[PDB]
Amino acid sequence: KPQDRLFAGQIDRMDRFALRYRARKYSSEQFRMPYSGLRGQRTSLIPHQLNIAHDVGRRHAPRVLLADEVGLGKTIEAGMILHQQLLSGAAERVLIIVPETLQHQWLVEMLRRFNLRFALFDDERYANPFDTEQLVICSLDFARRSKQRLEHLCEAEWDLLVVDEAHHLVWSEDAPSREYQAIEQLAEHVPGVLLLTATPEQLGMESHFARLRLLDPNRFHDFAQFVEEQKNYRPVADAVAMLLAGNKLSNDELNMLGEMIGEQDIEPLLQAANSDSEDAQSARQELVSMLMDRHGTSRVLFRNTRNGVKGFPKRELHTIKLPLPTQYQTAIKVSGIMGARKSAEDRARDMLYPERIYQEFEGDNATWWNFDPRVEWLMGYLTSHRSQKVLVICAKAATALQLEQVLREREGIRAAVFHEGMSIIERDRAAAWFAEEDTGAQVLLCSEIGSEGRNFQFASHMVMFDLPFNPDLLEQRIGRLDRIGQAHDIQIHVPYLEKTAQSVLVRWYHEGLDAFEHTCPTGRTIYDSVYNDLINYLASPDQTEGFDDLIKNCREQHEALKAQLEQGRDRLLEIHSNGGEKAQALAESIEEQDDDTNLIAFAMNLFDIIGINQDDRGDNMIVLTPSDHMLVPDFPGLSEDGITITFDREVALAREDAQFITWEHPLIRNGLDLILSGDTGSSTISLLKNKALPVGTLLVELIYVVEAQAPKQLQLNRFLPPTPVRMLLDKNGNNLAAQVEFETFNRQLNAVNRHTGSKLVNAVQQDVHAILQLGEAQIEKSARALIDAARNEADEKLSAELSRLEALRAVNPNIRDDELTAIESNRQQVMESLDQAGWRLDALRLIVVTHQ
Ligand SMILES: Nc1ncnc2c1ncn2[C@@H]1O[C@H](COP(=O)(O)OP(=O)(O)O)[C@@H](O)[C@H]1O
Ligand SMILES: [Cl-]
Ligand SMILES: [Cl-]
Ligand SMILES: [Cl-]
Ligand SMILES: [Cl-]
Ligand SMILES: [Mg+2]
């Protein structure tokens, strides 16, 4: 094929040949690396997250509970797992079931951090229809709405299922939820399952066990036995955990340990660890790993905690008590007198957002913002903090929009607005404007959706124009800025109107739950426990008999539950969930990759040759725009509006509007596919100025490709991706390639006029044919060596992993049958597909020695 082009007179420019060869070499090498699938995401490199993702993401059909505490990165961990599985080919179809109001947050996270475009399925967009899309997000309610729909989902042949906030799957002996039942049915037909929930087990042990049974109903079949085994385990594991903290062990703990591990002699290991010797610490970390292989929830549950990971800011509450204006006092009394009585909730909501009462009787569009002291306080705060990036949160979009107008007209400060009525692209623009340094918006006004999952590293100040109606929404608001890696303490300003539901609720959240300044896993439990009572205080804030006691009771419940949670921590599992030194090393290794000058040089040459225009902005960023004369009509991922790119991870994290270019980015992969599936650079001729060789000497640079045809799911690329084999032959068939390195030789060559070129080739066409014949014999030898080596490394690696899981099963009940059968079956189909591998000539460059 490539020789046919050359002789038909079709001669590419030399630089195209070099680009083609580099593209093959690079793509064949970036497939066989340990951190593959953990580079391309727009995230910081946090060890505990990478620990989970690298462990879970490389398994066959992962079935796990991701139970990290709030803010630790359960969404990011799920993303890295999906990213790895979809890049490697282990998965192709993914379903993500989330709570109703979280769909857009997930859609943006998957696309903007993992370059994965999920299709949103709801009833408005579609009143089976799931074969249409490979990546689907929908709500839990949507998925369980009808029995027809559920069965549609089960038969849609999903590879992986992700269920966010899985504590909504509630179970009971006599009436499990519809939610639970729906996931129970789906989990039987999807091989891989990720359940995400931070809910501590002490608040629902039974439901916790039910979720584990969704993952492995075979192993998790006896609630009582499971609890008993965990209870007997804690004594062992608590001590060992106190040893990784360096408090030496007893003689009691030493026989319990020798027994807990009867599969081998650990007397040396124990003698070391339980002593003040320089070999004591490593003896401890190894013991910890042995205990975790025997853990009851080993391999299935990952629970990192904020106490352990410790990268989170302090939270500081600043309340401002403001006088209640006569206009609102009047409206409250009028409503109590002339009021068509409403629900408890609706009266409370009226008292929490008093502008709603005022608008009811003065008509909507009444200028509440002209006398509401919260508005005046906000104007004052913002005009004296003009250089502070401030996140301002209201419950309702209409309130945020009304504030934007006031702030602009009365003080000339332009705020970005963020609410669910706006399109994704509209929120993208508002987000970029708020993130813009020095020239951008100083304020982001949000409805209850906050800032979704977008990072504003520079924002540490938050104003709650009003308060949310329940504690889950409160923590979600604070979680917009209380994020891992935020250095500056969060200042939470709460201006509130005295003698209203606002003052009641601010006191309840703060004094009852301590929910502002400390992350509160107790909030929902206490709220539901006192709901009726609290709602009446909110509905009648001027009738507060017994409120002081409610506060006292609620705080006592909060402290009691906090104590239970502290006492019930599995501190061994917490340590093991962070990943230790192996996880730190994995993060360090990925970061070493990041500084890849090869990729930057390759990508520029690639885009240039494809025909994409490149404008440099100086700030580690470049603007890419389509051109008239590009290799293809429309390059996927490239709009006529252009795209901003960066190759630097820290820039990409600060500029969420820019693409983060890595070997794993679709632009590179699409770019490689374009060049390598086509003719570009496959046929050329060059001159070599060299007087130490006879003039007219002919050299043929041959690039063969060795590749095995197989389904992507087999993941042959781990062992034999399409691999180039470069030969450099003379007339006698001597292959010089082993001692003539490609780059050094490539530099020594000269381009030649294409017309003069096609004349040189025709003059030596027959010599070339003979050389090509000599190459075919040598490629068979080379390809057979490459193939046999890969077939053997597949044997070694895959048999090694099957042995590792069989050895784990001897001590661990959580290794599943289908896991061992999957490795076994894959080791077989991989070896067979390689022994059908083939080769072909991909490119050639003729080289003619001159002396001139
Ligand atoms: N490694 C990371 N790099 C960048 N952003 C991160 C990282 N980890 C978490 N975040 C951000 O922190 C926020 C919380 O992440 P998330 O996974 O939703 O926490 P949760 O465990 O409560 O579900 C999100 O906005 C996410 O984008
Ligand atoms: Cl992988
Ligand atoms: Cl895929
Ligand atoms: Cl006032
Ligand atoms: Cl942020
Ligand atoms: Mg979450």
Short mmCIF file of N, CA and C in Angstrom, two decimals, residues 659-768:
data_model
loop_
_atom_site.label_atom_id
_atom_site.label_comp_id
_atom_site.label_asym_id
_atom_site.label_seq_id
_atom_site.Cartn_x
_atom_site.Cartn_y
_atom_site.Cartn_z
N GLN A 659 -9.35 23.28 28.15
CA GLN A 659 -9.10 21.85 28.08
C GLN A 659 -7.73 21.50 28.66
N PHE A 660 -7.67 20.37 29.37
CA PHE A 660 -6.44 19.88 29.99
C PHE A 660 -5.88 18.79 29.08
N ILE A 661 -4.85 19.12 28.32
CA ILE A 661 -4.33 18.22 27.29
C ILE A 661 -3.35 17.23 27.92
N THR A 662 -3.65 15.95 27.79
CA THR A 662 -2.73 14.90 28.20
C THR A 662 -2.79 13.83 27.13
N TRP A 663 -1.97 12.79 27.28
CA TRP A 663 -2.06 11.67 26.34
C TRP A 663 -3.45 11.05 26.33
N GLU A 664 -4.24 11.27 27.39
CA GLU A 664 -5.54 10.64 27.54
C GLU A 664 -6.68 11.57 27.15
N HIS A 665 -6.38 12.74 26.61
CA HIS A 665 -7.43 13.66 26.21
C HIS A 665 -7.97 13.29 24.83
N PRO A 666 -9.29 13.40 24.62
CA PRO A 666 -9.85 13.01 23.31
C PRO A 666 -9.24 13.76 22.13
N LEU A 667 -8.80 15.00 22.32
CA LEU A 667 -8.17 15.73 21.22
C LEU A 667 -6.93 15.01 20.73
N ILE A 668 -6.08 14.56 21.65
CA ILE A 668 -4.90 13.79 21.25
C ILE A 668 -5.32 12.48 20.60
N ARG A 669 -6.20 11.73 21.26
CA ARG A 669 -6.60 10.42 20.74
C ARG A 669 -7.29 10.56 19.39
N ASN A 670 -8.22 11.50 19.27
CA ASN A 670 -8.79 11.79 17.96
C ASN A 670 -7.71 12.21 16.96
N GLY A 671 -6.76 13.05 17.40
CA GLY A 671 -5.72 13.48 16.49
C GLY A 671 -4.85 12.33 16.01
N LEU A 672 -4.46 11.45 16.93
CA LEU A 672 -3.70 10.27 16.56
C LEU A 672 -4.50 9.39 15.61
N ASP A 673 -5.77 9.12 15.94
CA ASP A 673 -6.59 8.27 15.08
C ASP A 673 -6.68 8.84 13.67
N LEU A 674 -6.84 10.15 13.56
CA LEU A 674 -6.91 10.78 12.24
C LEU A 674 -5.65 10.49 11.43
N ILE A 675 -4.48 10.79 11.99
CA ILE A 675 -3.23 10.62 11.24
C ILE A 675 -3.00 9.15 10.91
N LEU A 676 -3.16 8.28 11.91
CA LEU A 676 -2.72 6.90 11.78
C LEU A 676 -3.70 6.02 11.02
N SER A 677 -4.98 6.38 10.95
CA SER A 677 -5.91 5.62 10.13
C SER A 677 -5.91 6.07 8.68
N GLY A 678 -5.15 7.12 8.34
CA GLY A 678 -5.10 7.65 7.01
C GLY A 678 -3.77 7.42 6.33
N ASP A 679 -3.51 8.22 5.29
CA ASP A 679 -2.33 8.09 4.46
C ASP A 679 -1.21 9.04 4.86
N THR A 680 -1.48 10.02 5.72
CA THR A 680 -0.55 11.10 5.99
C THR A 680 0.80 10.56 6.42
N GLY A 681 1.84 10.90 5.66
CA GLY A 681 3.21 10.58 6.03
C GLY A 681 3.64 9.16 5.75
N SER A 682 2.88 8.40 4.97
CA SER A 682 3.20 7.00 4.77
C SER A 682 4.19 6.76 3.64
N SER A 683 4.53 7.79 2.87
CA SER A 683 5.32 7.61 1.66
C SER A 683 6.08 8.88 1.35
N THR A 684 7.41 8.80 1.31
CA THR A 684 8.23 9.97 1.04
C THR A 684 9.62 9.54 0.58
N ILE A 685 10.42 10.53 0.20
CA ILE A 685 11.79 10.32 -0.26
C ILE A 685 12.63 11.49 0.22
N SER A 686 13.86 11.19 0.65
CA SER A 686 14.76 12.21 1.16
C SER A 686 16.16 11.97 0.63
N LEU A 687 17.01 12.98 0.78
CA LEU A 687 18.41 12.90 0.39
C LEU A 687 19.28 12.91 1.64
N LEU A 688 20.42 12.23 1.56
CA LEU A 688 21.38 12.15 2.66
C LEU A 688 22.74 12.64 2.18
N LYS A 689 23.15 13.81 2.64
CA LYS A 689 24.49 14.30 2.32
C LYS A 689 25.50 13.52 3.14
N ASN A 690 26.28 12.65 2.49
CA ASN A 690 27.27 11.85 3.19
C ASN A 690 28.26 11.32 2.16
N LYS A 691 29.51 11.79 2.25
CA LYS A 691 30.56 11.40 1.31
C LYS A 691 31.29 10.14 1.74
N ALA A 692 31.09 9.68 2.97
CA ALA A 692 31.65 8.41 3.40
C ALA A 692 30.90 7.21 2.83
N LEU A 693 29.83 7.44 2.06
CA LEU A 693 29.07 6.38 1.43
C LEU A 693 29.02 6.61 -0.08
N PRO A 694 28.99 5.55 -0.88
CA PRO A 694 28.97 5.74 -2.34
C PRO A 694 27.78 6.59 -2.76
N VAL A 695 28.05 7.58 -3.61
CA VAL A 695 26.98 8.42 -4.15
C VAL A 695 25.90 7.51 -4.73
N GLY A 696 24.65 7.93 -4.63
CA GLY A 696 23.54 7.13 -5.11
C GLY A 696 23.19 5.95 -4.24
N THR A 697 23.94 5.69 -3.17
CA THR A 697 23.56 4.62 -2.26
C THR A 697 22.11 4.80 -1.85
N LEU A 698 21.40 3.69 -1.78
CA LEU A 698 19.98 3.67 -1.49
C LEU A 698 19.75 3.05 -0.12
N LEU A 699 18.98 3.74 0.71
CA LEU A 699 18.53 3.22 2.00
C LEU A 699 17.01 3.36 2.05
N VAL A 700 16.34 2.36 2.61
CA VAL A 700 14.89 2.36 2.70
C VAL A 700 14.52 2.26 4.17
N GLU A 701 13.87 3.30 4.69
CA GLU A 701 13.38 3.30 6.06
C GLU A 701 11.96 2.75 6.03
N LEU A 702 11.77 1.58 6.65
CA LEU A 702 10.51 0.86 6.63
C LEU A 702 9.91 0.86 8.02
N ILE A 703 8.65 1.26 8.12
CA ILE A 703 7.91 1.21 9.38
C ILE A 703 6.81 0.19 9.18
N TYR A 704 6.98 -1.00 9.76
CA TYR A 704 5.91 -1.98 9.86
C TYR A 704 5.12 -1.77 11.15
N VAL A 705 3.89 -2.26 11.17
CA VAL A 705 3.05 -2.25 12.37
C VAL A 705 2.65 -3.68 12.69
N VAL A 706 2.86 -4.08 13.93
CA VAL A 706 2.45 -5.39 14.44
C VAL A 706 1.24 -5.16 15.34
N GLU A 707 0.13 -5.82 15.02
CA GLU A 707 -1.12 -5.59 15.72
C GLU A 707 -1.99 -6.84 15.65
N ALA A 708 -2.74 -7.07 16.71
CA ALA A 708 -3.66 -8.19 16.81
C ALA A 708 -5.08 -7.68 16.75
N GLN A 709 -5.90 -8.28 15.89
CA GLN A 709 -7.31 -7.95 15.82
C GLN A 709 -8.03 -8.64 16.98
N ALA A 710 -8.75 -7.86 17.78
CA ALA A 710 -9.47 -8.42 18.92
C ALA A 710 -10.46 -7.37 19.42
N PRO A 711 -11.48 -7.80 20.17
CA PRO A 711 -12.39 -6.83 20.79
C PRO A 711 -11.67 -5.99 21.84
N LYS A 712 -12.09 -4.73 21.95
CA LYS A 712 -11.47 -3.81 22.89
C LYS A 712 -11.56 -4.32 24.32
N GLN A 713 -12.62 -5.05 24.66
CA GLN A 713 -12.81 -5.51 26.03
C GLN A 713 -11.71 -6.46 26.50
N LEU A 714 -11.02 -7.13 25.58
CA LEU A 714 -9.93 -8.03 25.97
C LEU A 714 -8.71 -7.26 26.48
N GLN A 715 -8.60 -5.98 26.15
CA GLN A 715 -7.50 -5.14 26.61
C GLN A 715 -6.15 -5.71 26.18
N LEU A 716 -6.04 -6.06 24.90
CA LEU A 716 -4.75 -6.50 24.38
C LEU A 716 -3.70 -5.40 24.48
N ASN A 717 -4.14 -4.13 24.44
CA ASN A 717 -3.20 -3.01 24.42
C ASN A 717 -2.28 -3.00 25.62
N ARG A 718 -2.66 -3.65 26.72
CA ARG A 718 -1.76 -3.74 27.85
C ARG A 718 -0.50 -4.52 27.49
N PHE A 719 -0.58 -5.37 26.47
CA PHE A 719 0.49 -6.30 26.15
C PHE A 719 1.02 -6.14 24.73
N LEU A 720 0.16 -5.84 23.77
CA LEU A 720 0.58 -5.60 22.39
C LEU A 720 -0.39 -4.62 21.74
N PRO A 721 -0.21 -3.33 21.98
CA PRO A 721 -0.90 -2.32 21.15
C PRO A 721 -0.32 -2.35 19.74
N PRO A 722 -0.97 -1.67 18.77
CA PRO A 722 -0.33 -1.55 17.44
C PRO A 722 1.07 -1.00 17.61
N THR A 723 2.09 -1.81 17.34
CA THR A 723 3.46 -1.45 17.65
C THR A 723 4.23 -1.23 16.37
N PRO A 724 4.93 -0.11 16.23
CA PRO A 724 5.79 0.08 15.06
C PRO A 724 7.09 -0.71 15.19
N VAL A 725 7.56 -1.21 14.05
CA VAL A 725 8.88 -1.81 13.94
C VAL A 725 9.59 -1.10 12.80
N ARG A 726 10.61 -0.34 13.16
CA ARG A 726 11.37 0.46 12.22
C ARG A 726 12.58 -0.34 11.77
N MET A 727 12.73 -0.46 10.46
CA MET A 727 13.88 -1.03 9.76
C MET A 727 14.49 0.02 8.84
N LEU A 728 15.80 -0.11 8.64
CA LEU A 728 16.57 0.79 7.77
C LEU A 728 17.47 -0.09 6.90
N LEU A 729 17.01 -0.41 5.69
CA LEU A 729 17.67 -1.43 4.89
C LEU A 729 18.48 -0.86 3.73
N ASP A 730 19.61 -1.51 3.41
CA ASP A 730 20.36 -1.19 2.20
C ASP A 730 20.07 -2.25 1.13
N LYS A 731 20.75 -2.14 -0.01
CA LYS A 731 20.43 -3.02 -1.13
C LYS A 731 20.64 -4.49 -0.79
N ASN A 732 21.60 -4.79 0.08
CA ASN A 732 21.87 -6.17 0.46
C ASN A 732 20.97 -6.67 1.57
N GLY A 733 20.08 -5.83 2.09
CA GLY A 733 19.18 -6.23 3.15
C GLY A 733 19.72 -6.05 4.54
N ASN A 734 20.88 -5.42 4.70
CA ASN A 734 21.39 -5.10 6.03
C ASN A 734 20.45 -4.11 6.72
N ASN A 735 20.02 -4.46 7.93
CA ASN A 735 19.15 -3.60 8.74
C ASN A 735 20.01 -2.79 9.69
N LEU A 736 20.08 -1.49 9.45
CA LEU A 736 20.90 -0.59 10.24
C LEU A 736 20.15 0.06 11.40
N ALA A 737 18.88 -0.28 11.61
CA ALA A 737 18.04 0.54 12.48
C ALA A 737 18.50 0.49 13.93
N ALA A 738 19.05 -0.65 14.36
CA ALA A 738 19.45 -0.78 15.76
C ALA A 738 20.55 0.19 16.15
N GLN A 739 21.37 0.62 15.20
CA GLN A 739 22.46 1.54 15.49
C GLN A 739 22.28 2.92 14.87
N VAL A 740 21.23 3.13 14.08
CA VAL A 740 20.92 4.44 13.53
C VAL A 740 19.60 4.88 14.15
N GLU A 741 19.69 5.60 15.27
CA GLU A 741 18.51 6.04 16.01
C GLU A 741 17.69 7.00 15.15
N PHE A 742 16.37 6.92 15.31
CA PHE A 742 15.47 7.62 14.39
C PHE A 742 15.70 9.13 14.40
N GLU A 743 15.70 9.75 15.58
CA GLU A 743 15.76 11.21 15.64
C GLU A 743 17.07 11.74 15.07
N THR A 744 18.20 11.15 15.47
CA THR A 744 19.49 11.65 14.99
C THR A 744 19.58 11.51 13.48
N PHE A 745 19.16 10.36 12.95
CA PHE A 745 19.20 10.16 11.50
C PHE A 745 18.22 11.09 10.79
N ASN A 746 17.03 11.26 11.36
CA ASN A 746 16.02 12.11 10.73
C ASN A 746 16.55 13.52 10.52
N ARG A 747 17.36 14.01 11.46
CA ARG A 747 17.88 15.37 11.33
C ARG A 747 18.85 15.49 10.16
N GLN A 748 19.59 14.42 9.85
CA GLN A 748 20.62 14.47 8.82
C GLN A 748 20.05 14.48 7.40
N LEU A 749 18.74 14.28 7.24
CA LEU A 749 18.15 14.15 5.92
C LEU A 749 17.68 15.50 5.39
N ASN A 750 17.62 15.60 4.06
CA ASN A 750 17.19 16.81 3.38
C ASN A 750 15.94 16.52 2.57
N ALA A 751 15.00 17.47 2.59
CA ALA A 751 13.86 17.40 1.69
C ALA A 751 14.33 17.53 0.24
N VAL A 752 13.47 17.09 -0.67
CA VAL A 752 13.75 17.14 -2.10
C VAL A 752 12.49 17.60 -2.82
N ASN A 753 12.69 18.34 -3.91
CA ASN A 753 11.57 18.74 -4.74
C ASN A 753 10.76 17.51 -5.12
N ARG A 754 9.43 17.64 -5.09
CA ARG A 754 8.57 16.49 -5.34
C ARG A 754 8.68 15.99 -6.77
N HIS A 755 8.86 16.90 -7.73
CA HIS A 755 9.02 16.47 -9.12
C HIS A 755 10.36 15.76 -9.32
N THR A 756 11.45 16.38 -8.86
CA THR A 756 12.73 15.69 -8.84
C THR A 756 12.61 14.38 -8.07
N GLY A 757 11.81 14.38 -7.00
CA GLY A 757 11.63 13.20 -6.19
C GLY A 757 11.02 12.05 -6.96
N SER A 758 9.87 12.28 -7.59
CA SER A 758 9.19 11.21 -8.32
C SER A 758 10.04 10.69 -9.47
N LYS A 759 11.03 11.46 -9.91
CA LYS A 759 11.95 10.99 -10.94
C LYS A 759 13.01 10.07 -10.35
N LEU A 760 13.53 10.42 -9.17
CA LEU A 760 14.47 9.54 -8.48
C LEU A 760 13.84 8.18 -8.19
N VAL A 761 12.60 8.17 -7.71
CA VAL A 761 11.97 6.90 -7.34
C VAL A 761 11.80 6.01 -8.57
N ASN A 762 11.25 6.56 -9.66
CA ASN A 762 11.02 5.76 -10.85
C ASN A 762 12.33 5.20 -11.39
N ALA A 763 13.43 5.91 -11.18
CA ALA A 763 14.73 5.44 -11.64
C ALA A 763 15.23 4.25 -10.82
N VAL A 764 14.75 4.06 -9.60
CA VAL A 764 15.20 2.97 -8.74
C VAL A 764 14.04 2.08 -8.28
N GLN A 765 12.90 2.14 -8.98
CA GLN A 765 11.73 1.39 -8.55
C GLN A 765 12.06 -0.09 -8.36
N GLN A 766 12.84 -0.67 -9.27
CA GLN A 766 13.11 -2.10 -9.19
C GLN A 766 14.02 -2.44 -8.01
N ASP A 767 15.05 -1.63 -7.78
CA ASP A 767 15.87 -1.83 -6.59
C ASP A 767 15.02 -1.78 -5.32
N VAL A 768 14.07 -0.84 -5.26
CA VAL A 768 13.22 -0.72 -4.08
C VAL A 768 12.40 -1.98 -3.89
#
